[PDB]
Amino acid sequence: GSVYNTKKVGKRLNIQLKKGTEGLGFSITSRDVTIGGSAPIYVKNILPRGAAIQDGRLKAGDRLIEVNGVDLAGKSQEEVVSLLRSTKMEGTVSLLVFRQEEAFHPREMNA
């Protein structure tokens, strides 16, 4: 048998993080967000200490899609920022992110 994990294309990863001293240890950013929907949330920063960085699968620039199975990628940026800031306290937080390798490149010049 053989296994080939696709190191290319966008896939979703679910990372479970337990709150420690830094809590989660990450922050979220939003880009091009007028309201939300087509413009989502990406991880803004992975702090040197914290659950997020210890796991390593969650990195800065990965797109936050859902949490615990609850779809929120169609929610406004304000809603999702509130979700993360609210910070649930069960123990582990399972967040599902979208990791994507963009096969497009910036243009040399635009006339």
PDB file of N, CA, C and O in Angstrom, residues 9-65:
ATOM      1  N   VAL A   9      -3.136  22.233  -3.081  1.00  0.00           N
ATOM      2  CA  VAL A   9      -4.607  22.394  -3.007  1.00  0.00           C
ATOM      3  C   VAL A   9      -5.060  22.790  -1.561  1.00  0.00           C
ATOM      4  O   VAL A   9      -4.291  22.677  -0.583  1.00  0.00           O
ATOM      5  N   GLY A  10      -6.272  23.294  -1.440  1.00  0.00           N
ATOM      6  CA  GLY A  10      -6.790  23.662  -0.160  1.00  0.00           C
ATOM      7  C   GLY A  10      -7.558  22.535   0.503  1.00  0.00           C
ATOM      8  O   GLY A  10      -8.452  21.934  -0.109  1.00  0.00           O
ATOM      9  N   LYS A  11      -7.205  22.244   1.733  1.00  0.00           N
ATOM     10  CA  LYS A  11      -7.872  21.225   2.543  1.00  0.00           C
ATOM     11  C   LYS A  11      -8.169  21.803   3.903  1.00  0.00           C
ATOM     12  O   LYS A  11      -7.604  22.841   4.273  1.00  0.00           O
ATOM     13  N   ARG A  12      -9.030  21.160   4.644  1.00  0.00           N
ATOM     14  CA  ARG A  12      -9.412  21.665   5.936  1.00  0.00           C
ATOM     15  C   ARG A  12      -8.804  20.824   7.023  1.00  0.00           C
ATOM     16  O   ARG A  12      -8.744  19.601   6.914  1.00  0.00           O
ATOM     17  N   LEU A  13      -8.350  21.475   8.058  1.00  0.00           N
ATOM     18  CA  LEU A  13      -7.731  20.812   9.179  1.00  0.00           C
ATOM     19  C   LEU A  13      -8.448  21.220  10.443  1.00  0.00           C
ATOM     20  O   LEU A  13      -8.808  22.385  10.601  1.00  0.00           O
ATOM     21  N   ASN A  14      -8.661  20.286  11.320  1.00  0.00           N
ATOM     22  CA  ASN A  14      -9.282  20.572  12.596  1.00  0.00           C
ATOM     23  C   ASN A  14      -8.259  20.432  13.694  1.00  0.00           C
ATOM     24  O   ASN A  14      -7.719  19.346  13.924  1.00  0.00           O
ATOM     25  N   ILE A  15      -7.979  21.525  14.346  1.00  0.00           N
ATOM     26  CA  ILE A  15      -6.977  21.574  15.375  1.00  0.00           C
ATOM     27  C   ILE A  15      -7.642  21.763  16.739  1.00  0.00           C
ATOM     28  O   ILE A  15      -8.429  22.695  16.931  1.00  0.00           O
ATOM     29  N   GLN A  16      -7.353  20.864  17.652  1.00  0.00           N
ATOM     30  CA  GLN A  16      -7.842  20.952  19.015  1.00  0.00           C
ATOM     31  C   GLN A  16      -6.807  21.624  19.882  1.00  0.00           C
ATOM     32  O   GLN A  16      -5.644  21.210  19.905  1.00  0.00           O
ATOM     33  N   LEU A  17      -7.219  22.632  20.606  1.00  0.00           N
ATOM     34  CA  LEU A  17      -6.314  23.374  21.453  1.00  0.00           C
ATOM     35  C   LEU A  17      -6.886  23.524  22.843  1.00  0.00           C
ATOM     36  O   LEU A  17      -8.049  23.844  22.998  1.00  0.00           O
ATOM     37  N   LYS A  18      -6.069  23.316  23.829  1.00  0.00           N
ATOM     38  CA  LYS A  18      -6.468  23.462  25.211  1.00  0.00           C
ATOM     39  C   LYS A  18      -5.888  24.734  25.753  1.00  0.00           C
ATOM     40  O   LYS A  18      -4.757  25.097  25.435  1.00  0.00           O
ATOM     41  N   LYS A  19      -6.649  25.411  26.541  1.00  0.00           N
ATOM     42  CA  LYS A  19      -6.216  26.675  27.089  1.00  0.00           C
ATOM     43  C   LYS A  19      -5.196  26.509  28.180  1.00  0.00           C
ATOM     44  O   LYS A  19      -5.447  25.853  29.199  1.00  0.00           O
ATOM     45  N   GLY A  20      -4.064  27.101  27.963  1.00  0.00           N
ATOM     46  CA  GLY A  20      -3.016  27.090  28.940  1.00  0.00           C
ATOM     47  C   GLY A  20      -2.773  28.479  29.471  1.00  0.00           C
ATOM     48  O   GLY A  20      -3.722  29.240  29.664  1.00  0.00           O
ATOM     49  N   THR A  21      -1.522  28.835  29.645  1.00  0.00           N
ATOM     50  CA  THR A  21      -1.159  30.124  30.191  1.00  0.00           C
ATOM     51  C   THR A  21      -1.434  31.260  29.205  1.00  0.00           C
ATOM     52  O   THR A  21      -1.814  32.352  29.599  1.00  0.00           O
ATOM     53  N   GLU A  22      -1.269  30.985  27.923  1.00  0.00           N
ATOM     54  CA  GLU A  22      -1.518  31.980  26.901  1.00  0.00           C
ATOM     55  C   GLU A  22      -2.914  31.781  26.343  1.00  0.00           C
ATOM     56  O   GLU A  22      -3.327  32.465  25.398  1.00  0.00           O
ATOM     57  N   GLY A  23      -3.634  30.852  26.934  1.00  0.00           N
ATOM     58  CA  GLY A  23      -4.933  30.504  26.450  1.00  0.00           C
ATOM     59  C   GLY A  23      -4.809  29.683  25.201  1.00  0.00           C
ATOM     60  O   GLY A  23      -4.346  28.539  25.249  1.00  0.00           O
ATOM     61  N   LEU A  24      -5.189  30.261  24.097  1.00  0.00           N
ATOM     62  CA  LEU A  24      -5.074  29.615  22.811  1.00  0.00           C
ATOM     63  C   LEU A  24      -3.698  29.878  22.219  1.00  0.00           C
ATOM     64  O   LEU A  24      -3.010  28.958  21.766  1.00  0.00           O
ATOM     65  N   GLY A  25      -3.299  31.130  22.236  1.00  0.00           N
ATOM     66  CA  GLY A  25      -2.001  31.500  21.732  1.00  0.00           C
ATOM     67  C   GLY A  25      -2.036  31.957  20.293  1.00  0.00           C
ATOM     68  O   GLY A  25      -1.025  31.892  19.597  1.00  0.00           O
ATOM     69  N   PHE A  26      -3.183  32.418  19.829  1.00  0.00           N
ATOM     70  CA  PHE A  26      -3.280  32.914  18.472  1.00  0.00           C
ATOM     71  C   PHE A  26      -4.308  34.011  18.373  1.00  0.00           C
ATOM     72  O   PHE A  26      -5.119  34.209  19.286  1.00  0.00           O
ATOM     73  N   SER A  27      -4.252  34.723  17.292  1.00  0.00           N
ATOM     74  CA  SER A  27      -5.130  35.819  17.027  1.00  0.00           C
ATOM     75  C   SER A  27      -5.660  35.664  15.596  1.00  0.00           C
ATOM     76  O   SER A  27      -5.063  34.940  14.800  1.00  0.00           O
ATOM     77  N   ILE A  28      -6.743  36.337  15.270  1.00  0.00           N
ATOM     78  CA  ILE A  28      -7.342  36.257  13.948  1.00  0.00           C
ATOM     79  C   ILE A  28      -7.390  37.648  13.292  1.00  0.00           C
ATOM     80  O   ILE A  28      -7.490  38.669  13.971  1.00  0.00           O
ATOM     81  N   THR A  29      -7.279  37.663  11.995  1.00  0.00           N
ATOM     82  CA  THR A  29      -7.311  38.862  11.198  1.00  0.00           C
ATOM     83  C   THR A  29      -8.348  38.696  10.098  1.00  0.00           C
ATOM     84  O   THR A  29      -8.725  37.574   9.753  1.00  0.00           O
ATOM     85  N   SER A  30      -8.795  39.774   9.569  1.00  0.00           N
ATOM     86  CA  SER A  30      -9.728  39.765   8.495  1.00  0.00           C
ATOM     87  C   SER A  30      -9.197  40.632   7.370  1.00  0.00           C
ATOM     88  O   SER A  30      -8.641  41.705   7.621  1.00  0.00           O
ATOM     89  N   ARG A  31      -9.337  40.177   6.152  1.00  0.00           N
ATOM     90  CA  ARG A  31      -8.878  40.947   5.025  1.00  0.00           C
ATOM     91  C   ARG A  31      -9.977  41.091   4.009  1.00  0.00           C
ATOM     92  O   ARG A  31     -10.766  40.157   3.810  1.00  0.00           O
ATOM     93  N   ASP A  32     -10.047  42.279   3.400  1.00  0.00           N
ATOM     94  CA  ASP A  32     -11.013  42.603   2.327  1.00  0.00           C
ATOM     95  C   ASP A  32     -12.447  42.504   2.830  1.00  0.00           C
ATOM     96  O   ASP A  32     -13.396  42.454   2.044  1.00  0.00           O
ATOM     97  N   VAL A  33     -12.604  42.527   4.139  1.00  0.00           N
ATOM     98  CA  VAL A  33     -13.893  42.336   4.758  1.00  0.00           C
ATOM     99  C   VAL A  33     -14.762  43.574   4.754  1.00  0.00           C
ATOM    100  O   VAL A  33     -14.547  44.522   5.508  1.00  0.00           O
ATOM    101  N   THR A  34     -15.713  43.580   3.885  1.00  0.00           N
ATOM    102  CA  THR A  34     -16.699  44.598   3.887  1.00  0.00           C
ATOM    103  C   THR A  34     -17.704  44.281   4.999  1.00  0.00           C
ATOM    104  O   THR A  34     -18.034  45.135   5.829  1.00  0.00           O
ATOM    105  N   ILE A  35     -18.146  43.027   5.023  1.00  0.00           N
ATOM    106  CA  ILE A  35     -19.027  42.496   6.056  1.00  0.00           C
ATOM    107  C   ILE A  35     -18.577  41.070   6.409  1.00  0.00           C
ATOM    108  O   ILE A  35     -18.228  40.773   7.560  1.00  0.00           O
ATOM    109  N   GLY A  36     -18.577  40.207   5.413  1.00  0.00           N
ATOM    110  CA  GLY A  36     -18.153  38.842   5.589  1.00  0.00           C
ATOM    111  C   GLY A  36     -18.815  37.938   4.580  1.00  0.00           C
ATOM    112  O   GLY A  36     -19.772  38.350   3.908  1.00  0.00           O
ATOM    113  N   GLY A  37     -18.327  36.731   4.449  1.00  0.00           N
ATOM    114  CA  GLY A  37     -18.901  35.782   3.512  1.00  0.00           C
ATOM    115  C   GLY A  37     -17.881  35.323   2.507  1.00  0.00           C
ATOM    116  O   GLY A  37     -17.377  34.205   2.585  1.00  0.00           O
ATOM    117  N   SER A  38     -17.566  36.179   1.569  1.00  0.00           N
ATOM    118  CA  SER A  38     -16.540  35.885   0.595  1.00  0.00           C
ATOM    119  C   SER A  38     -15.208  36.392   1.156  1.00  0.00           C
ATOM    120  O   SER A  38     -14.118  35.946   0.760  1.00  0.00           O
ATOM    121  N   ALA A  39     -15.323  37.329   2.077  1.00  0.00           N
ATOM    122  CA  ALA A  39     -14.211  37.876   2.798  1.00  0.00           C
ATOM    123  C   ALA A  39     -14.235  37.295   4.219  1.00  0.00           C
ATOM    124  O   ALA A  39     -15.115  37.638   5.016  1.00  0.00           O
ATOM    125  N   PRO A  40     -13.336  36.358   4.522  1.00  0.00           N
ATOM    126  CA  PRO A  40     -13.304  35.663   5.798  1.00  0.00           C
ATOM    127  C   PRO A  40     -12.167  36.092   6.764  1.00  0.00           C
ATOM    128  O   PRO A  40     -11.489  37.118   6.576  1.00  0.00           O
ATOM    129  N   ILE A  41     -11.980  35.259   7.789  1.00  0.00           N
ATOM    130  CA  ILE A  41     -10.983  35.437   8.830  1.00  0.00           C
ATOM    131  C   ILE A  41      -9.792  34.488   8.608  1.00  0.00           C
ATOM    132  O   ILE A  41      -9.966  33.326   8.244  1.00  0.00           O
ATOM    133  N   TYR A  42      -8.605  34.997   8.828  1.00  0.00           N
ATOM    134  CA  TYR A  42      -7.378  34.227   8.756  1.00  0.00           C
ATOM    135  C   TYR A  42      -6.659  34.408  10.064  1.00  0.00           C
ATOM    136  O   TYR A  42      -6.885  35.389  10.744  1.00  0.00           O
ATOM    137  N   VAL A  43      -5.843  33.473  10.437  1.00  0.00           N
ATOM    138  CA  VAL A  43      -5.069  33.614  11.661  1.00  0.00           C
ATOM    139  C   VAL A  43      -4.064  34.762  11.499  1.00  0.00           C
ATOM    140  O   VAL A  43      -3.282  34.777  10.538  1.00  0.00           O
ATOM    141  N   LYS A  44      -4.099  35.719  12.416  1.00  0.00           N
ATOM    142  CA  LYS A  44      -3.254  36.893  12.305  1.00  0.00           C
ATOM    143  C   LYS A  44      -1.884  36.641  12.881  1.00  0.00           C
ATOM    144  O   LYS A  44      -0.894  37.120  12.349  1.00  0.00           O
ATOM    145  N   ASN A  45      -1.814  35.857  13.926  1.00  0.00           N
ATOM    146  CA  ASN A  45      -0.555  35.690  14.630  1.00  0.00           C
ATOM    147  C   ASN A  45      -0.600  34.423  15.454  1.00  0.00           C
ATOM    148  O   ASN A  45      -1.626  34.117  16.067  1.00  0.00           O
ATOM    149  N   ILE A  46       0.477  33.690  15.422  1.00  0.00           N
ATOM    150  CA  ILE A  46       0.682  32.519  16.244  1.00  0.00           C
ATOM    151  C   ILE A  46       1.757  32.892  17.245  1.00  0.00           C
ATOM    152  O   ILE A  46       2.928  33.071  16.872  1.00  0.00           O
ATOM    153  N   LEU A  47       1.363  33.060  18.480  1.00  0.00           N
ATOM    154  CA  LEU A  47       2.267  33.512  19.509  1.00  0.00           C
ATOM    155  C   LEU A  47       3.239  32.407  19.908  1.00  0.00           C
ATOM    156  O   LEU A  47       2.859  31.244  19.947  1.00  0.00           O
ATOM    157  N   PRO A  48       4.526  32.770  20.195  1.00  0.00           N
ATOM    158  CA  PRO A  48       5.597  31.812  20.558  1.00  0.00           C
ATOM    159  C   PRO A  48       5.218  30.800  21.664  1.00  0.00           C
ATOM    160  O   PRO A  48       5.761  29.688  21.709  1.00  0.00           O
ATOM    161  N   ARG A  49       4.313  31.179  22.548  1.00  0.00           N
ATOM    162  CA  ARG A  49       3.825  30.271  23.572  1.00  0.00           C
ATOM    163  C   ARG A  49       2.333  30.141  23.415  1.00  0.00           C
ATOM    164  O   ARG A  49       1.652  31.123  23.097  1.00  0.00           O
ATOM    165  N   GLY A  50       1.827  28.961  23.614  1.00  0.00           N
ATOM    166  CA  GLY A  50       0.416  28.757  23.522  1.00  0.00           C
ATOM    167  C   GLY A  50       0.093  27.465  22.849  1.00  0.00           C
ATOM    168  O   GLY A  50       0.955  26.862  22.205  1.00  0.00           O
ATOM    169  N   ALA A  51      -1.138  27.042  22.980  1.00  0.00           N
ATOM    170  CA  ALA A  51      -1.591  25.772  22.447  1.00  0.00           C
ATOM    171  C   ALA A  51      -1.441  25.705  20.934  1.00  0.00           C
ATOM    172  O   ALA A  51      -0.954  24.708  20.399  1.00  0.00           O
ATOM    173  N   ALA A  52      -1.849  26.778  20.259  1.00  0.00           N
ATOM    174  CA  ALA A  52      -1.821  26.848  18.794  1.00  0.00           C
ATOM    175  C   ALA A  52      -0.441  26.569  18.233  1.00  0.00           C
ATOM    176  O   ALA A  52      -0.291  25.778  17.292  1.00  0.00           O
ATOM    177  N   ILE A  53       0.567  27.179  18.821  1.00  0.00           N
ATOM    178  CA  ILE A  53       1.905  27.017  18.317  1.00  0.00           C
ATOM    179  C   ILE A  53       2.459  25.633  18.680  1.00  0.00           C
ATOM    180  O   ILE A  53       3.238  25.056  17.930  1.00  0.00           O
ATOM    181  N   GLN A  54       2.036  25.103  19.833  1.00  0.00           N
ATOM    182  CA  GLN A  54       2.481  23.784  20.274  1.00  0.00           C
ATOM    183  C   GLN A  54       1.955  22.694  19.362  1.00  0.00           C
ATOM    184  O   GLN A  54       2.626  21.683  19.138  1.00  0.00           O
ATOM    185  N   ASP A  55       0.755  22.891  18.841  1.00  0.00           N
ATOM    186  CA  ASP A  55       0.181  21.928  17.918  1.00  0.00           C
ATOM    187  C   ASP A  55       0.909  22.005  16.586  1.00  0.00           C
ATOM    188  O   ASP A  55       1.312  20.986  16.019  1.00  0.00           O
ATOM    189  N   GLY A  56       1.082  23.217  16.093  1.00  0.00           N
ATOM    190  CA  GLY A  56       1.858  23.424  14.891  1.00  0.00           C
ATOM    191  C   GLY A  56       1.066  23.318  13.597  1.00  0.00           C
ATOM    192  O   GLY A  56       1.530  23.786  12.554  1.00  0.00           O
ATOM    193  N   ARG A  57      -0.103  22.699  13.630  1.00  0.00           N
ATOM    194  CA  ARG A  57      -0.911  22.576  12.413  1.00  0.00           C
ATOM    195  C   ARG A  57      -1.631  23.872  12.120  1.00  0.00           C
ATOM    196  O   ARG A  57      -1.946  24.182  10.971  1.00  0.00           O
ATOM    197  N   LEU A  58      -1.880  24.623  13.159  1.00  0.00           N
ATOM    198  CA  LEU A  58      -2.498  25.915  13.038  1.00  0.00           C
ATOM    199  C   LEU A  58      -1.406  26.957  12.900  1.00  0.00           C
ATOM    200  O   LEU A  58      -0.545  27.078  13.774  1.00  0.00           O
ATOM    201  N   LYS A  59      -1.428  27.688  11.812  1.00  0.00           N
ATOM    202  CA  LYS A  59      -0.413  28.671  11.536  1.00  0.00           C
ATOM    203  C   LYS A  59      -1.053  29.994  11.131  1.00  0.00           C
ATOM    204  O   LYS A  59      -2.270  30.082  10.948  1.00  0.00           O
ATOM    205  N   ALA A  60      -0.229  31.014  10.973  1.00  0.00           N
ATOM    206  CA  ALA A  60      -0.707  32.319  10.589  1.00  0.00           C
ATOM    207  C   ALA A  60      -0.971  32.357   9.095  1.00  0.00           C
ATOM    208  O   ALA A  60      -0.082  32.059   8.289  1.00  0.00           O
ATOM    209  N   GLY A  61      -2.169  32.734   8.729  1.00  0.00           N
ATOM    210  CA  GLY A  61      -2.546  32.801   7.334  1.00  0.00           C
ATOM    211  C   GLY A  61      -3.518  31.729   6.957  1.00  0.00           C
ATOM    212  O   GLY A  61      -4.064  31.738   5.846  1.00  0.00           O
ATOM    213  N   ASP A  62      -3.728  30.783   7.853  1.00  0.00           N
ATOM    214  CA  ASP A  62      -4.726  29.770   7.621  1.00  0.00           C
ATOM    215  C   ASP A  62      -6.077  30.345   7.919  1.00  0.00           C
ATOM    216  O   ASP A  62      -6.222  31.176   8.827  1.00  0.00           O
ATOM    217  N   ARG A  63      -7.051  29.945   7.160  1.00  0.00           N
ATOM    218  CA  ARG A  63      -8.361  30.546   7.236  1.00  0.00           C
ATOM    219  C   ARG A  63      -9.262  29.816   8.192  1.00  0.00           C
ATOM    220  O   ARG A  63      -9.428  28.624   8.083  1.00  0.00           O
ATOM    221  N   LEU A  64      -9.853  30.547   9.108  1.00  0.00           N
ATOM    222  CA  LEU A  64     -10.719  29.963  10.104  1.00  0.00           C
ATOM    223  C   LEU A  64     -12.081  29.706   9.433  1.00  0.00           C
ATOM    224  O   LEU A  64     -12.698  30.630   8.898  1.00  0.00           O
ATOM    225  N   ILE A  65     -12.517  28.457   9.438  1.00  0.00           N
ATOM    226  CA  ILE A  65     -13.740  28.067   8.743  1.00  0.00           C
ATOM    227  C   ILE A  65     -14.872  27.801   9.713  1.00  0.00           C
ATOM    228  O   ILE A  65     -15.990  28.301   9.531  1.00  0.00           O
TER     229      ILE A  65
END
